[PDB]
Design a binder for this molecule. Structure first.
Ligand code: PER
Ligand code: CA
Ligand code: CA
Ligand code: CA
Ligand code: FE
Ligand code: FE
Ligand code: FE
Ligand code: FE
Lengths: 125, 126
């Protein structure tokens, strides 16, 4: 695994993010954890692909062109902004708006989002 | 059983992961249980590992520790993390850099964490 990759255990639901890479395979419930590759799930891109809005002193990210549902059983668990060697995560809860604001200085940024149902998604400016 | 924000390490291959979503199953790697890296439990110089939090205009500046920790290839602070509310901001570092990070954020209460490749996980709060 490599830094920043997200793995999920399809059996029990554990989901982790890599802070330090290594050669070993992450395992849970007696099976290799699944690498959650961005934008691979067959889902509505207009509801999952993060939309990056540049603002003075940072960025605002909303998932996706169409506000994603934020229901108890279907919501965006978090939004993440990757800039340089920074990884900013904003966890969300059902009922909140599917968006986040990040105060940071960086021209190129990658925005990621995770739907408990539809997986990992990303976009860059 | 993993809980959000916990950090686990495989002492064999060196994989280190942070929990985003908890659950029942135990994390395993290289045929052994991954080790939960509990904060401030390692026997090391607290003045070099416990993060010091400094409030600044529009955020916080965090340094590791009151005495600058080494940033060598074989001994350095791998990252500094700031926790506030449902926010988890991480600044990864590299040998040769200063053992510090600046976070622009609006939060009266914050927890700062740091990880030394040799001496483990450490934290402090304001
Ligand atoms: O449908 O998200
Ligand atoms: Ca993180
Ligand atoms: Ca065990
Ligand atoms: Ca155990
Ligand atoms: Fe391992
Ligand atoms: Fe969805
Ligand atoms: Fe599991
Ligand atoms: Fe150390």
């Amino acid at each position: 695994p490599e830094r920043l990759q997200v793995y999920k255990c399809e059996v029990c639901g554990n989901i982790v993010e890599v802070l330090n890479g290594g050669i070993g395979e992450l395992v849970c419930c007696n099976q290799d954890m699944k690498l959650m590759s961005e934008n691979t799930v067959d889902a509505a891109k207009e509801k999952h692909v993060p939309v990056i809005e540049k603002i003075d002193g940072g960025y605002k990210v909303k998932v996706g062109a169409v506000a994603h549902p934020m229901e108890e059983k279907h919501y965006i668990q978090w939004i993440e902004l990757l800039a340089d060697d920074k990884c900013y995560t904003q966890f969300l809860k059902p009922g909140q708006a599917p968006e986040a604001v990040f105060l940071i200085e960086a021209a190129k940024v990658v925005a990621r989002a995770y739907c408990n149902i539809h997986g990992h998604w990303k976009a860059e400016n």
